[PDB]
Amino acid sequence: MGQVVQFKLSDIGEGIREVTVKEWYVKEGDTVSQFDSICEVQSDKASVTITSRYDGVIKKLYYNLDDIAYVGKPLVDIETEALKDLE
């Protein structure tokens, strides 16, 4: 209690092509829900979608449906219940 979990582009390797967001359903300072996913990226390989499984608070967002995210650096910070996903 008192910490936020950050999402980092990891759909690809840490030294290859990057990927952009295909579906965005959140905004800076906005809250997420179990049905309201944060971001979703789609690559020729497979379609990735980031769910929440709970209602979390999103404070800042930099990459949009058009911006490409790179592996190795976080993308957005959101507050969600303890999830093994990142911790």
Side-chain angles (χ1 to χ4, degrees), residues 65-85:
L65 293 112
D66 266 78
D67 314 350
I68 309 268
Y70 335 134
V71 190
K73 257 302 199 114
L75 184 155
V76 56
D77 326 54
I78 327 91
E79 232 176 291
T80 18
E81 198 126 338
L83 235 104
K84 53 158 197 252
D85 219 327

Side-chain angles (χ1 to χ4, degrees), residues 33-68:
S33 268
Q34 292 141 96
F35 47 61
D36 209 32
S37 20
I38 307 204
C39 26
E40 296 99 301
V41 305
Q42 301 217 328
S43 210
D44 50 5
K45 279 182 293 287
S47 323
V48 211
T49 65
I50 303 106
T51 32
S52 200
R53 334 304 237 158
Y54 254 113
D55 309 36
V57 188
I58 310 165
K59 210 195 165 235
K60 68 289 236 78
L61 288 126
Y62 196 81
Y63 294 136
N64 293 100
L65 293 112
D66 266 78
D67 314 350
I68 309 268

Side-chain angles (χ1 to χ4, degrees), residues 9 11-13 15-19 42-45 68-69 71:
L9 187 300
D11 308 288
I12 28 287
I16 68 119
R17 74 201 223 73
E18 294 121 280
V19 66
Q42 301 217 328
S43 210
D44 50 5
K45 279 182 293 287
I68 309 268
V71 190

